[PDB]
Every structure is written in C-alpha cells, then in structure tokens.
Amino acid sequence: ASLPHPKIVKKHTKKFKRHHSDRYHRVAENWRKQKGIDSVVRRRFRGNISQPKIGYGSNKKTKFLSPSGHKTFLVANVKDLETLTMHTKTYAAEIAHNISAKNRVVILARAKALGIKVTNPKGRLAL
Amino acid sequence: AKSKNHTAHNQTRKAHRNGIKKPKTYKYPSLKGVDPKFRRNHKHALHGTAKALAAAKK
Amino acid sequence: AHFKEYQVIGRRLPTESVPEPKLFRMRIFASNEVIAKSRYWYFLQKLHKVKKASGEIVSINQINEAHPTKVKNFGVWVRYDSRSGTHNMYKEIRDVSRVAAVETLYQDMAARHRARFRSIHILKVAEIEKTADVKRQYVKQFLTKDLKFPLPHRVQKSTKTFSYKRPSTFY
Amino acid sequence: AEQVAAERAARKAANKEKRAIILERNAAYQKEYETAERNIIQAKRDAKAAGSYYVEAQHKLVFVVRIKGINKIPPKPRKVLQLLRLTRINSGTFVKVTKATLELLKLIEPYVAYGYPSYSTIRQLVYKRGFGKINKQRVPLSDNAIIEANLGKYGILSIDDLIHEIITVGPHFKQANNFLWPFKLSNPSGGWGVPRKFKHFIQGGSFGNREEFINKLVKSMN
Amino acid sequence: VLKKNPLKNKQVLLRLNPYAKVFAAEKLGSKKAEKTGTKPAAVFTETLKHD
Amino acid sequence: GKSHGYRSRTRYMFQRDFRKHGAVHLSTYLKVYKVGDIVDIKANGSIQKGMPHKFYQGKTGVVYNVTKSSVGVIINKMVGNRYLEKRLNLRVEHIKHSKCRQEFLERVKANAAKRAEAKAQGVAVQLKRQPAQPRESRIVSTEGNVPQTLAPVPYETFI
Amino acid sequence: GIDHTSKQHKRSGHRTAPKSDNVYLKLLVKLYTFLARRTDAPFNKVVLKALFLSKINRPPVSVSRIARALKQEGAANKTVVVVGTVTDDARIFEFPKTTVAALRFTAGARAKIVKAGGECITLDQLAVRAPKGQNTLILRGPRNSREAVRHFGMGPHKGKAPRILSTGRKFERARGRRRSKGFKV
RNA sequence: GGGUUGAUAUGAUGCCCUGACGAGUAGGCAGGCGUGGAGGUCAGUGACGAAGCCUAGACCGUAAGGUCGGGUCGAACGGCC
RNA sequence: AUGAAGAGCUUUUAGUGGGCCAUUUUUGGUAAGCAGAACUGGCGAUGCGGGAUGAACCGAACGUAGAGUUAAGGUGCCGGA
Ligand SMILES: [Mg+2]
Ligand SMILES: [Mg+2]
Ligand SMILES: [Mg+2]
Ligand SMILES: [Mg+2]
Ligand SMILES: [Mg+2]
Ligand SMILES: [Mg+2]
Ligand SMILES: [Mg+2]
Ligand SMILES: [Mg+2]
Ligand SMILES: [Mg+2]
Ligand SMILES: [Mg+2]
Ligand SMILES: [Mg+2]
Ligand SMILES: [Mg+2]
Ligand SMILES: [Mg+2]
Ligand SMILES: [Mg+2]
Ligand SMILES: [Mg+2]
Ligand SMILES: [Mg+2]
Ligand SMILES: [Mg+2]
Ligand SMILES: [Mg+2]
Ligand SMILES: [Mg+2]
Ligand SMILES: [Mg+2]
C-alpha cells in the first residue's frame, strides 16, 4: 500500500556511542564530542570510533520513512487520526504510549475503516 | 629565564592574507605641503575662471 | 635506458655581425632526443662560448649501425669523475653494435668503479679493425682460432615449487 | 498559436545551415592540417637533397600538467600555478609559447610536466574532457550551441573550430583557452614510466619539458 | 544529465561533428601519400656516417 | 649598545664615486622639473642639505611641489600590510628624471603617427607590443659551412 | 586537494530577505522581486535592494530635499521615490505639486505635500503606475550625517570626535590637544 | 548563480535547475536538541492506570535526542506558538 | 603576457602576544637534540600512505560510499606485489 520509494540507504546503522561509555559507567552512551587537546577520537587516528558528521545524512527522498515506506505520525484520538484520511499511502499512525486500552480499540477500528496503517496494533491488548 | 627576542617569521604570510594593496590614487589630489605662494594665486585664478565660464555660457 | 646514437648539429644564433656560423656537430649516446640535445649543450658549453639560449639546433638524426650483425671489437676512451678526482680510461669491449658496447661500458663502470652516468664522459668509440691491435686479454681471449667452450653446471628453472625427482646439471 | 510545427520546422532548417557550415569548415581544416604536415615533410626532404638542413619552426603551443600536490610550494611557484589555473594535481592547461611564458615555466618546472601536444591528444582532450566557463560555471560542452553562444563573437561555432584556434594558435587563443576549464585528468593508466617522479625527465624523472613525449602521458591520463 | 563521451558513441560524435561521416567514408585516417624520388646529397650521408 | 641613526648603514651608498668626487656639473641645476614628473632618487654625498633617508635611494616618485632649490616628491612606502604615501623635500642634486617615461612617450607619439598614417587606408595597425615570439622555420646551408665534428676532451692538470 | 585562491563557502556579504518580520514589507518584497525578475528594469532591482536595508541605511528624506530634486531640469513632473520615510521641513515655505512614493510619511510631510496639491503614494501603487520605473526619481538620504560616524576613524591627526559623555572645560581639552600641555595630538 | 504567483490545494522563509566546494586547536558566527517554570491553544493524555524506574526488544534522526512495545508503578502529565 | 575565483569600503569584536622543526644563508661556541638572527615551508592546530618504531622527513592534505589509476615506498617469508 505504501508509496513507491527507492531502496532505503542509511550509511551508518550503528549508533554513535561516546568514547569510554564502555569504560566508565558515569559516562553515558549519548554522543558527546570529545573536546580534548590530545584526544585520539577528535584527531581521527586510525582505529578509533567514528564521529557523526553531515556526510552521513540520509537521502531527502527516504528520510523519516520507516521500512514499510510510511512516515510515522503520533495520534492520541480519532480526530488526530482523521488528518491522515487522504494520506494513507504516505503516513502511518502510531498510537501514543499514554492512551488507554479502551480507546485504542476505537482508534484501531476507525483506522481499519479508513484504511490507515497502524504501527503498534498490539499495545494493551488482553486475551 | 631568557626568551626569544625577535623574528620576522610568519609576518609576510600575515601581511599577504589581506595585505599589500596599493593605497589608492585619486583625481585632484591634496594640495598639502604645496607652496603657499602658488596656492594663493591658484585660488584667484580658479575664481576668475569660474566667473569667465559663467559669463560665457550665461 | 637502452641507448641510441644521435647526430646532433648546432649553431650559434645568427646576427648581423656574423651570419652563417660554423655548425658544430656531435655524436651522443642517449635514450631519446631530449637527453641527446641536453648533452649536446653540456659538451658544447665546455668547448665553446654558447648555451641553449644563444644557440640553436639545426638537425638531430638517429644513426643506426651499418652492420648490426658483424661482431666488432671496440675501444672506448672514457673520462670519469671518481670521489677523489678525475681519471681517464681505455676499455675494450667485444660486441655487435656501438650502442650495445656503450650500454655494457656504463654497466661495467657502475660495477667496477661505482661511477654514474652523470660522472662518465665518452671521448670516442672506435672499431679496432685489425686483430693484434687489441691489448686487453679479456677480449683477446675470444679471438682464438676455432674457439669452443662449454657451459658447465646448468640450472634449469622450474615452473613449479615441488619437483618429484632430483635435478641434474648435465649439459 | 499552434506553433508546434511551423517554428519547429524553421528552427530545424536554421540548424541544417549551421551544420552545413560546420561540415565545410571542418573539411577545410582537415585539408589545412594535412598540407601543413606534408609540406614540412617535403621541405625536410628537399633540404636533405640540396645538402642543407631544415630547422623546423619552434612550437607555439605547449600543454602543461601539474605533477605535484599542493603542499609545500614556495610563493612564486604557487602564484604562477594559480595563474596557469593549475590548482590541483593532474590539472592541465594549454599555454601560448612566448618569452613571457617560458620564464613562468622555468619557475614552475619542478612542479609540472609540459611539452608539445599533437592534434590527436588536443582533440581527444577537448572531446572527452571538454568543459566551458559559462557564467562562472563548469559546463560540459556536449553540443556546438554552447560554443556558438559563448565564442560566436570570435568566429567560433564548433568544438572543431575551437580545436583549430587552439592548435593553429590564432588571434583568439586567449579567449578560447580561458573559456576552456582546466582539464581534470586522471593518473596515467599505465603509470608514469619511471620509478621516481620528482626528477627532471632528463635525469630519469617526470617534470620538465618532455617535448613530444607529453602526448603519450596525456593519452594515458585521459 | 550525463556526459556521453565521443570517440565512442558514434551518435554524439556525429552530433558534434558532421564531418565524421565522410571522414570514415573516405578512410582519411589511412590516407596514402604520393611517392617521391628524392635522394639526399653525399654531404648529408658522409657527415652522418662520419666518426 | 644599538645604533639606528639617520645615516646608519650609508657608508658605501652615500659614497660619491671613483674619480667623480668634487663639485657637480651644472646640468643637474639647469634641468627643469614640473609637477607630475617622474624622478629617481640617488643621493649625492657632497650635498648634505636636502638629503633623502637611505630608504629612498633607488626609489622612483612623482613631483608634487617645486620651490627655490628643492622639489617635492611623492613615494609609496610599504609599512606592514599596506602602502603609505611619503612626501620628501629633496634638493635637485639628489634627483634625476626617469628615462622610462621619456621612452614611453616616444612610443605614444609613434603609435599616434602610425594610427594617423594607416587610417588613410584602413590596414589594422595592431599597435600593441608583443613578446618575443618563437622563431620561424628556416634552412641552413652547408656551402662552405660543412659541420665540424667535436668530441669531449680528456682530463689534464694544467698547473 | 585544491590550492584555493579564494575563501571557500563565503556569504555574498549582502542582505536578502529583510530581517524585519513585518508582513507588509515582506509583501512589498514579494512584489518587487517578481518585478525585478520579469521587467528587465534596473529600477525594480534598486528598490528591492533598498527594501532590504537597515534603518541607518534608510535615513529620512526631507521634503526640502525633494524640492531640490525637482528644481533639476526636466524633473518637475517626475515621480519621487523614497525607499524609507519622508520627514517635514519648516525651513521651506513653498512646495510643488509633485507626487511622492514612499514607505512611510510623517504627518507633517503628508500634510505639506497634500496642501501643495500633491499626493502621497505607496510603493505598491507605484508598481501599477510605473512597473518599469517610468519618469521616476529615486532619492536617498544622508548617511554620514549620523552621530556614530563622527567617531569612526578616531586617531591622531584625523579630527574625529572622541567618544565622550560629558563635554565642557576639563573634559579632553588638555595634554594631547594643545602645545602648552605637552603636545597637540 | 538562476527559474517559478497562473487559475484549482495544502507549505515563496516554498518547489526546482545549474556549478563548485567540504582538514582544523584557541576563537567567532549560525541552525537545532534537551530541562524547571509563565501566557495561549490542542473543548490534548489519564485510576479501563499519569509521572518515574528496568528492558544485549523495535522505529526515526548525521547527532543532540525523540517515538513505540513489554515489565514495575499509583496520580497526575504532555504536543505546538 | 597570464589570471581575476567578483572589485572597492566601513564598523565592531574574539583569541593570541612562552613557540618549535627542516632545507639553504649566517653569528658565538671545541661542540651540542646548545644559544642567537635571515628567506621560505611546515608542526603547533593534521588525521591519511610510507620511513619497523617517531610532532616536524617523503608523498599527499580528510564530508559519506563504489569502481578504477597512482604518489612516496616497495615485491624471499613475516606482508599486499
Ligand atoms: Mg557507560
Ligand atoms: Mg594537540
Ligand atoms: Mg616573546
Ligand atoms: Mg595494472
Ligand atoms: Mg614510484
Ligand atoms: Mg550531473
Ligand atoms: Mg655607490
Ligand atoms: Mg575536496
Ligand atoms: Mg539562491
Ligand atoms: Mg572550539
Ligand atoms: Mg505507566
Ligand atoms: Mg542495561
Ligand atoms: Mg495516593
Ligand atoms: Mg587584539
Ligand atoms: Mg592584545
Ligand atoms: Mg599551544
Ligand atoms: Mg601534515
Ligand atoms: Mg622535496
Ligand atoms: Mg580501492
Ligand atoms: Mg605475498
């Protein structure tokens, strides 16, 4: 159902991890640039981690697209969902985390009626 | 504790970054330092010349 | 490289004081015409008041051997700069062409005297047309009647790295 | 305003005339080149017959290639390379031979390889790596309309007339060669021939005047 | 959108040059020369063969 | 101690000449300098009045003023990253006309003459100078000029 | 690599898209960039560039300046264009019947120009009356008349208004300003 | 550096075309991410489970970070200007 | 002659004001990986291939990737040839 798109290319599927997030627990994995005068990572010696830069950017045709080819749009109710009535081949709905189980039923029913794809049609389902 | 006294190292690179431009040349340069005995006459001569052209194409 | 012989003819540039200058000539052993013309001026600067800016080249021509299959005996007169000073040499080379003789001479000088192309000058190469004018025994040795000699201890080169029999040096 | 037939046909007719003109001009240029070669050949022959020597005309055109990278260049060579538009390794430019340019070349000799190009390599360069400076942009030529629009002032209509203004160094060589973007050449496909580049071609290297051996190198690089 | 190289792609070759059609028709890349009966003088040959 | 005075390092520069000491010939004083004239500066050491600083030796400038015994010259002086204009009041013994301007103006009037001469028939003067071109083809004869073969000479001491 | 002759990735150094967030000015820009794109007239480009300018590069233009400009020859029946504001000037006692196009008019300027029989015009009505700049006369105001320019280039022997809050005797009128006290500059 | 307001549809800071370029400490500038609180709005989420916490489970983004699922929990909390 | 990559102009402000190395010129000193100057180029601020190893030497300067060709240096094995 998705709109035709090219092969999706990423150029770096590996998460850029902070230097020594593997060595110290106080050092979190969220990327920080090394600003040190003698940093091997800042100086880009062979054999060190890679630094994020703009050349790794994704093609503007395939940016923000999930592997299904849809752009994700968060919804909390049927009125927010109905904005994607005429955009089913481009945008897929994601029900927000804080939505209740009984309202997820309504959102999923209306999305099935309108032909809208839902990325998480299994949250808070009992059986 | 001695130190380095003087070197002209890097000064040509620095100057030529935005450098050795000629200052510039204008038409009608300054009459500054020119002889006052000449300036005093040039004033009157220019006055008369302006008057003459005015009365000419009046 | 592999050498060639070039006839290079040069001429001080004409003037009103003296047109038609005297058209000097040289034989140059060189791998190409650019090096031939460089060496022409190198030597003509040593002999006469002229340089590439005040002179010109009227013709450069390749000289091929008239008899490339007759086995000649050559004598070569060499000037070479050593590390201490400068020396002269006479060497006898038995070969089939002037260019081959000069190649062999440059190699023998590089080998026995560590002299380089920049250090070597060729004064002249002359075919010894009469035997018994040869004076070097290492050439005179191959000028003997019905000469014949073997090549002992032959080594056959193997395409593989494993041989399944011991080889032989017979010949 | 149907205009899809009448004006289209008029444009096609106007193009037919330009192509006829180009065809006849190119035939003339071929007849000129072949005669210019044959006549100097026969002049050498006749001087040999008469016991004289034929001193061929010194060349009016060289092709210069940058052989050295951009690091560690003194200022005078750096400026001369910028003025010849050789801003990267293996960039090439045609140069008119004059006393004003030979000294430039003597200054930049350890950084370039230059010599005397042939019609074949000039033509191959302009046809494979042929780029024009149109409004400060590097436009592939790919058609004679660009050349007619940007050099039609100077009698030039075709890539062939351009090649002619280059090789038969004409009144408008400056404008043609400036229109031509610096040739962006690859490294030689067979190699440089020597083990070591930064000696003179005479001393076993690669830089300097390799008078007529530059065609081989350039064809390997193009 | 793409630089097609002449010296291959005869179509682009002919787009740039219409003379390329008759160049091949006449085989001007393999033109034969008129034979000549010129012989050098003796001074040239003896100077060349001189020592 | 150090020493940077007005006439420091002028020993050989403000030297007079060999066999040209004494007074100066009268052509220096009979020459005529108008405003706009280009003049080279070469200090005479025998006239201590009106001297230039050693910096302006061998410098060429333009006249901006004329007085009883002196001449006002403008010079361009490199000071760091720029040029500043400098006004000297120099006696004429340290001053001579530059011959470059005379040789340019002769060419000016010659080009004007050529243009007026060849406009009567329209033949495209092409008045611009050009560099020394490459030399054209020619033929060299061996008539009485047979090639003289040469060879490298051996090594001798010559002492 | 490249041996670069110029500085890479350098902005032009010229303003586009005026940084004023005024929507009416943005609309004037939308109109005049279209006209500059399609009319082949230099007037449109001049006006478009002028609409980008800052306040100090858009000085006010006095009606007396406009009167001078119309006292030129062949300029009496012209349309005066001021990319900026027009201010009043009581130092004139007559004003002609011209029409004046400007962004803003002061109340006094508008009243003077109207009382003289003229009309005050906007740059959008100027666009329909004169899309290529027919019979126009662009006036710019004085830029170096500002106070800040007095201090630009302060140094010895320039004569360039030192930066000073309180003026009077004993405020920068001593050593460095008179030979009796050391030196004079 | 240029093209493109034409009516009908969505964004003129938009879309599009063309060419070139891309190292960087100190330092400068720009565009963005995230936190506590304030005004406005989504008649936003929420005891049918908010926030927080854990999760070699998933997705988006060059990254800052954002989103989802599962577990735990119990009362509040977010998106946009 | 060649080239111009836009030319010219102004305002304001940051950091810096310990330097060091190589070729060549040169001063003191027996000399110094010493001290001090001149010109350029570099390190500092710079990773990459090579020099086994190295701030500076050779080569070459860096967005992310693919293919090809090469520089310097190399092709017995370690090691691609
Ligand atoms: Mg950690
Ligand atoms: Mg560091
Ligand atoms: Mg210091
Ligand atoms: Mg190969
Ligand atoms: Mg090599
Ligand atoms: Mg393309
Ligand atoms: Mg003297
Ligand atoms: Mg690059
Ligand atoms: Mg733009
Ligand atoms: Mg920083
Ligand atoms: Mg919860
Ligand atoms: Mg964990
Ligand atoms: Mg409770
Ligand atoms: Mg400062
Ligand atoms: Mg300071
Ligand atoms: Mg530091
Ligand atoms: Mg480096
Ligand atoms: Mg070197
Ligand atoms: Mg590879
Ligand atoms: Mg191997």
GROMACS .gro file of N, CA, C and O (backbone and C1' of nucleotides) in nm, chain H residues 33-69:
model
  259
 1006C        P    1   1.455   2.202   1.789
 1006C      O5'    2   1.531   2.098   1.881
 1006C      C5'    3   1.554   1.966   1.834
 1006C      C4'    4   1.642   1.888   1.927
 1006C      C3'    5   1.596   1.878   2.071
 1006C      O3'    6   1.489   1.790   2.092
 1006C      C1'    7   1.827   1.922   2.065
 1007G        P    8   1.365   1.836   2.183
 1007G      O5'    9   1.424   1.837   2.330
 1007G      C5'   10   1.450   1.715   2.395
 1007G      C4'   11   1.544   1.730   2.512
 1007G      C3'   12   1.490   1.805   2.632
 1007G      O3'   13   1.401   1.728   2.711
 1007G      C1'   14   1.706   1.881   2.584
 1008U        P   15   1.270   1.795   2.775
 1008U      O5'   16   1.324   1.868   2.905
 1008U      C5'   17   1.381   1.793   3.010
 1008U      C4'   18   1.441   1.878   3.118
 1008U      C3'   19   1.348   1.974   3.189
 1008U      O3'   20   1.263   1.911   3.284
 1008U      C1'   21   1.550   2.084   3.140
 1009G        P   22   1.108   1.950   3.294
 1009G      O5'   23   1.105   2.069   3.401
 1009G      C5'   24   1.137   2.045   3.537
 1009G      C4'   25   1.155   2.174   3.613
 1009G      C3'   26   1.039   2.272   3.606
 1009G      O3'   27   0.936   2.240   3.696
 1009G      C1'   28   1.240   2.387   3.564
 1010G        P   29   0.784   2.237   3.645
 1010G      O5'   30   0.749   2.389   3.616
 1010G      C5'   31   0.698   2.472   3.719
 1010G      C4'   32   0.731   2.617   3.698
 1010G      C3'   33   0.635   2.697   3.611
 1010G      O3'   34   0.515   2.733   3.676
 1010G      C1'   35   0.856   2.746   3.548
 1011A        P   36   0.378   2.741   3.594
 1011A      O5'   37   0.391   2.874   3.508
 1011A      C5'   38   0.388   3.001   3.570
 1011A      C4'   39   0.386   3.114   3.471
 1011A      C3'   40   0.278   3.108   3.365
 1011A      O3'   41   0.152   3.153   3.411
 1011A      C1'   42   0.484   3.153   3.263
 1012G        P   43   0.018   3.092   3.350
 1012G      O5'   44   0.001   3.167   3.211
 1012G      C5'   45  -0.018   3.307   3.207
 1012G      C4'   46  -0.031   3.356   3.066
 1012G      C3'   47  -0.123   3.275   2.976
 1012G      O3'   48  -0.260   3.298   2.997
 1012G      C1'   49   0.077   3.316   2.863
 1013G        P   50  -0.363   3.177   2.976
 1013G      O5'   51  -0.351   3.146   2.821
 1013G      C5'   52  -0.378   3.249   2.728
 1013G      C4'   53  -0.359   3.207   2.585
 1013G      C3'   54  -0.430   3.081   2.541
 1013G      O3'   55  -0.567   3.101   2.510
 1013G      C1'   56  -0.208   3.077   2.464
 1014U        P   57  -0.670   2.980   2.528
 1014U      O5'   58  -0.627   2.876   2.417
 1014U      C5'   59  -0.651   2.902   2.280
 1014U      C4'   60  -0.586   2.799   2.193
 1014U      C3'   61  -0.640   2.657   2.204
 1014U      O3'   62  -0.757   2.637   2.127
 1014U      C1'   63  -0.403   2.654   2.210
 1015C        P   64  -0.845   2.504   2.144
 1015C      O5'   65  -0.743   2.386   2.111
 1015C      C5'   66  -0.737   2.331   1.980
 1015C      C4'   67  -0.648   2.209   1.973
 1015C      C3'   68  -0.708   2.082   2.030
 1015C      O3'   69  -0.789   2.016   1.934
 1015C      C1'   70  -0.484   2.109   2.106
 1016A        P   71  -0.931   1.951   1.973
 1016A      O5'   72  -0.986   2.042   2.091
 1016A      C5'   73  -1.115   2.020   2.144
 1016A      C4'   74  -1.131   2.088   2.277
 1016A      C3'   75  -1.143   1.997   2.398
 1016A      O3'   76  -1.018   1.951   2.446
 1016A      C1'   77  -1.315   2.157   2.405
 1017G        P   78  -1.006   1.808   2.518
 1017G      O5'   79  -0.861   1.758   2.476
 1017G      C5'   80  -0.831   1.732   2.340
 1017G      C4'   81  -0.694   1.673   2.325
 1017G      C3'   82  -0.662   1.560   2.422
 1017G      O3'   83  -0.712   1.434   2.378
 1017G      C1'   84  -0.490   1.719   2.430
 1018U        P   85  -0.792   1.339   2.480
 1018U      O5'   86  -0.677   1.263   2.558
 1018U      C5'   87  -0.578   1.192   2.486
 1018U      C4'   88  -0.473   1.134   2.577
 1018U      C3'   89  -0.523   1.062   2.701
 1018U      O3'   90  -0.567   0.930   2.675
 1018U      C1'   91  -0.350   1.209   2.762
 1019G        P   92  -0.705   0.877   2.738
 1019G      O5'   93  -0.673   0.860   2.892
 1019G      C5'   94  -0.567   0.777   2.934
 1019G      C4'   95  -0.525   0.802   3.076
 1019G      C3'   96  -0.634   0.793   3.181
 1019G      O3'   97  -0.666   0.659   3.217
 1019G      C1'   98  -0.506   0.987   3.218
 1020A        P   99  -0.817   0.616   3.247
 1020A      O5'  100  -0.804   0.513   3.367
 1020A      C5'  101  -0.742   0.554   3.488
 1020A      C4'  102  -0.740   0.446   3.592
 1020A      C3'  103  -0.874   0.418   3.660
 1020A      O3'  104  -0.880   0.281   3.699
 1020A      C1'  105  -0.721   0.500   3.819
 1021C        P  106  -0.999   0.188   3.646
 1021C      O5'  107  -0.958   0.156   3.495
 1021C      C5'  108  -0.849   0.070   3.466
 1021C      C4'  109  -0.843   0.034   3.320
 1021C      C3'  110  -0.796   0.146   3.228
 1021C      O3'  111  -0.717   0.093   3.121
 1021C      C1'  112  -1.010   0.075   3.162
 1022G        P  113  -0.558   0.079   3.133
 1022G      O5'  114  -0.515   0.190   3.238
 1022G      C5'  115  -0.511   0.327   3.201
 1022G      C4'  116  -0.430   0.408   3.299
 1022G      C3'  117  -0.281   0.380   3.297
 1022G      O3'  118  -0.207   0.500   3.323
 1022G      C1'  119  -0.366   0.333   3.510
 1023A        P  120  -0.071   0.531   3.243
 1023A      O5'  121  -0.040   0.683   3.277
 1023A      C5'  122  -0.103   0.789   3.207
 1023A      C4'  123  -0.061   0.921   3.264
 1023A      C3'  124   0.089   0.939   3.281
 1023A      O3'  125   0.151   0.986   3.163
 1023A      C1'  126  -0.021   0.994   3.483
 1024A        P  127   0.296   0.931   3.121
 1024A      O5'  128   0.391   0.979   3.239
 1024A      C5'  129   0.408   1.118   3.264
 1024A      C4'  130   0.479   1.145   3.394
 1024A      C3'  131   0.609   1.072   3.417
 1024A      O3'  132   0.718   1.128   3.345
 1024A      C1'  133   0.479   1.062   3.612
 1025G        P  134   0.826   1.032   3.275
 1025G      O5'  135   0.903   0.965   3.396
 1025G      C5'  136   0.978   1.045   3.486
 1025G      C4'  137   1.010   0.971   3.614
 1025G      C3'  138   1.093   0.845   3.598
 1025G      O3'  139   1.231   0.870   3.585
 1025G      C1'  140   0.907   0.800   3.735
 1026C        P  141   1.317   0.797   3.471
 1026C      O5'  142   1.340   0.650   3.530
 1026C      C5'  143   1.401   0.633   3.656
 1026C      C4'  144   1.383   0.493   3.709
 1026C      C3'  145   1.428   0.380   3.618
 1026C      O3'  146   1.567   0.357   3.625
 1026C      C1'  147   1.213   0.332   3.703
 1027C        P  148   1.652   0.327   3.492
 1027C      O5'  149   1.621   0.175   3.461
 1027C      C5'  150   1.658   0.075   3.555
 1027C      C4'  151   1.607  -0.061   3.516
 1027C      C3'  152   1.634  -0.104   3.374
 1027C      O3'  153   1.766  -0.151   3.354
 1027C      C1'  154   1.409  -0.150   3.429
 1028U        P  155   1.838  -0.129   3.212
 1028U      O5'  156   1.752  -0.217   3.112
 1028U      C5'  157   1.740  -0.357   3.132
 1028U      C4'  158   1.641  -0.418   3.037
 1028U      C3'  159   1.661  -0.388   2.890
 1028U      O3'  160   1.764  -0.465   2.832
 1028U      C1'  161   1.433  -0.363   2.944
 1029A        P  162   1.896  -0.394   2.776
 1029A      O5'  163   2.001  -0.513   2.766
 1029A      C5'  164   1.968  -0.632   2.697
 1029A      C4'  165   2.028  -0.634   2.559
 1029A      C3'  166   1.995  -0.754   2.473
 1029A      O3'  167   1.869  -0.743   2.409
 1029A      C1'  168   2.228  -0.713   2.465
 1030G        P  169   1.760  -0.859   2.423
 1030G      O5'  170   1.662  -0.834   2.301
 1030G      C5'  171   1.638  -0.702   2.252
 1030G      C4'  172   1.503  -0.691   2.186
 1030G      C3'  173   1.487  -0.581   2.083
 1030G      O3'  174   1.544  -0.611   1.957
 1030G      C1'  175   1.304  -0.576   2.229
 1031A        P  176   1.614  -0.495   1.869
 1031A      O5'  177   1.492  -0.419   1.803
 1031A      C5'  178   1.404  -0.487   1.716
 1031A      C4'  179   1.282  -0.405   1.684
 1031A      C3'  180   1.306  -0.274   1.612
 1031A      O3'  181   1.330  -0.288   1.473
 1031A      C1'  182   1.158  -0.238   1.791
 1032C        P  183   1.436  -0.193   1.400
 1032C      O5'  184   1.361  -0.054   1.385
 1032C      C5'  185   1.251  -0.042   1.296
 1032C      C4'  186   1.182   0.091   1.310
 1032C      C3'  187   1.263   0.214   1.275
 1032C      O3'  188   1.277   0.236   1.136
 1032C      C1'  189   1.147   0.251   1.476
 1033C        P  190   1.403   0.317   1.080
 1033C      O5'  191   1.378   0.467   1.128
 1033C      C5'  192   1.265   0.539   1.081
 1033C      C4'  193   1.264   0.681   1.132
 1033C      C3'  194   1.393   0.759   1.120
 1033C      O3'  195   1.417   0.808   0.989
 1033C      C1'  196   1.302   0.791   1.335
 1034G        P  197   1.566   0.811   0.930
 1034G      O5'  198   1.636   0.930   1.010
 1034G      C5'  199   1.583   1.061   1.004
 1034G      C4'  200   1.642   1.150   1.109
 1034G      C3'  201   1.793   1.157   1.114
 1034G      O3'  202   1.849   1.238   1.013
 1034G      C1'  203   1.708   1.137   1.333
 1035U        P  204   1.968   1.180   0.921
 1035U      O5'  205   2.087   1.156   1.024
 1035U      C5'  206   2.180   1.051   1.003
 1035U      C4'  207   2.314   1.083   1.062
 1035U      C3'  208   2.316   1.111   1.212
 1035U      O3'  209   2.330   0.992   1.288
 1035U      C1'  210   2.434   1.281   1.096
 1036A        P  211   2.221   0.953   1.399
 1036A      O5'  212   2.258   1.047   1.522
 1036A      C5'  213   2.385   1.039   1.583
 1036A      C4'  214   2.423   1.168   1.650
 1036A      C3'  215   2.332   1.213   1.763
 1036A      O3'  216   2.365   1.151   1.886
 1036A      C1'  217   2.376   1.394   1.616
 1037A        P  218   2.251   1.119   1.994
 1037A      O5'  219   2.232   1.256   2.071
 1037A      C5'  220   2.342   1.328   2.123
 1037A      C4'  221   2.309   1.473   2.141
 1037A      C3'  222   2.188   1.501   2.228
 1037A      O3'  223   2.217   1.496   2.366
 1037A      C1'  224   2.185   1.637   2.033
 1038G        P  225   2.133   1.399   2.463
 1038G      O5'  226   1.989   1.465   2.464
 1038G      C5'  227   1.873   1.386   2.462
 1038G      C4'  228   1.787   1.419   2.343
 1038G      C3'  229   1.656   1.344   2.333
 1038G      O3'  230   1.556   1.392   2.420
 1038G      C1'  231   1.762   1.342   2.124
 1039G        P  232   1.454   1.289   2.488
 1039G      O5'  233   1.350   1.260   2.372
 1039G      C5'  234   1.289   1.367   2.303
 1039G      C4'  235   1.220   1.323   2.177
 1039G      C3'  236   1.123   1.207   2.189
 1039G      O3'  237   0.998   1.242   2.246
 1039G      C1'  238   1.260   1.171   2.003
 1040U        P  239   0.921   1.135   2.337
 1040U      O5'  240   0.876   1.023   2.233
 1040U      C5'  241   0.796   1.057   2.122
 1040U      C4'  242   0.769   0.940   2.032
 1040U      C3'  243   0.715   0.814   2.097
 1040U      O3'  244   0.579   0.821   2.134
 1040U      C1'  245   0.882   0.755   1.945
 1041C        P  246   0.529   0.736   2.261
 1041C      O5'  247   0.537   0.586   2.212
 1041C      C5'  248   0.456   0.543   2.104
 1041C      C4'  249   0.489   0.403   2.057
 1041C      C3'  250   0.474   0.292   2.158
 1041C      O3'  251   0.339   0.256   2.185
 1041C      C1'  252   0.673   0.261   2.036
 1042G        P  253   0.301   0.196   2.329
 1042G      O5'  254   0.363   0.050   2.327
 1042G      C5'  255   0.319  -0.046   2.232
 1042G      C4'  256   0.398  -0.173   2.240
 1042G      C3'  257   0.407  -0.239   2.377
 1042G      O3'  258   0.292  -0.314   2.411
 1042G      C1'  259   0.622  -0.230   2.282
   0.00000   0.00000   0.00000
